[PDB]
């Protein structure tokens, strides 16, 4: 049972390990560690939380790449181009439940409730993202943000919320988490599209991210075009798109620094935000 | 957030609601009812468990159809032809977590543990099935059986396990569950190759190994007639060929014998648990297929 449980687990995890070994930032690791400046979670619990968070993050990327027909991830072919969609779905989903299993080792009665809630949020966000893309209905800036706070902030919320289960630190971290979730997402959007080639391809495909959203709604005919496209569904700043994105990022950065200062400072979190902000300067 | 949650929910669940309308046997409900002879679960808990089980099962079917590249289910388009693979993955996975959420309403400390274990088993079984197919690894009979017990019985095991959490009856039903899991799957394998009526109702217009072909491959290890037949004819012809080869090597007889042993074992194990007329009658009816 040891030798072949281990073979099975290794087989099932192959697509996931492919992605995990690619060069990446582990921002969720770094964020959680920086947040522990406030929360003072014991190392053993923190390690579990970080593992859960990174597991779910990587698994969700496998799924994301299938859901939007991406070709590359972290510079390399997406897992499903190598292993097939079937094995990748299975692998990513297996990791979700291995994440659940690991949450149970936290031995806290609220942990599973929080994990369930955050996974449901994540799927709501993802599901909207997909729906818009499939119907070519470009979200507004505000719709995009709300979706991102579910799809991206869902996991940030899980890490910090699980930490809060093991901490007497009671300050409201939700505003800062919202800022950070938007910041990270929009920064990714910017990093992916700033060098026309990916940008134009996105527009062709109906792949919506912060720069293309700005570009689409910038044209006056946008409203009437988008309204025709939204009738098919259950759907309700004169500057360049990259400049607008850079400006949004600078605002989000400044806001983060304000919110960190409002919580008494956090040099490690500040240094992380500053490093990540080089991307758009 | 009130009127809006409902819209989003409906978007997310559309592929799942489509699949709910498709023909199906609802055996998991029938087996749960049969196990309730012993377990006598309070109706409020039983209703939740059955809903959880059916949700997880239907979600797994959405995923299964993507994972094995099915084109039809019971003669109708697979969900992902209608809604696309991205929406279906998202829908099925959302339902998994809605299932988790509902398991929490059972308010028993062991329910989530059971859920986790059984979902992990399900994924291991599915994952092996996929791996073998993708990597041209023909399993042995013993490996196939072990895979089937995970893939086919993972959710069966969850239903009964969750039931037993709210039952005074605490005897070990796992051996019987294993026998039943194998029996159901191998009977399906058999019926799908040996019975035109059963094939027509279930796998209408469908072209992936199974108990009989595994026996045929490993019993005549030098032959490659199975592989060669599958690589060839429109499916009626391919199937005839496969069927004749299986006939000629004794794979149908071997499968019938395996099923008879599984049947007899089930009756012995049911008797050892104190008897269960409903389950016995169901096994007997299902056993006609191979008599
Ligand atoms: C939801 C989002 C924004 C995914 C991208 O995250 P990362 O930029 O952290 O990707 P890796 O470093 O983990 O590759
Ligand atoms: Cl510190």
Residue numbers in the entry:
A (entry chain A): 1 to 195, 201 to 241, 252 to 296
B (entry chain B): 1 to 207, 212 to 236, 238 to 296
Q: What do the authors of the reporting publication say about this deposited model?
A:
Geranylgeranyl pyrophosphate synthase (GGPPS) catalyzes the production of geranylgeranyl pyrophosphate (GGPP), an isoprenoid intermediate required for protein geranylgeranylation. GGPPS synthesizes GGPP by condensing the allylic substrate farnesyl pyrophosphate (FPP) with the homoallylic substrate IPP, releasing inorganic pyrophosphate as a by-product.
In this study, we engineer double-site mutants of human GGPPS to eliminate the Cys247–Cys205 disulfide bond observed in the Y246D mutant. Indeed, the DL mutant consistently yields diffraction-quality crystals, enabling us to determine its structure at a resolution of 2.1 Å. As with Y246D, the asymmetric unit of the DL crystal contains a single homodimer, consistent with its oligomeric state confirmed by earlier solution studies. In the DL mutant, where Cys247 was replaced by Leu, these disulfide bonds were eliminated. However, this substitution introduced an unexpected crystallographic artefact: the formation of intermolecular disulfide bonds between the Cys205 residues of the asymmetric unit and those of a symmetry-related dimer. Second, the disulfide bonds disrupt the conformation of the α1–α3 insertion region, which acts as both an inter-dimer interface and as a partial lid for the enzyme’s active site.
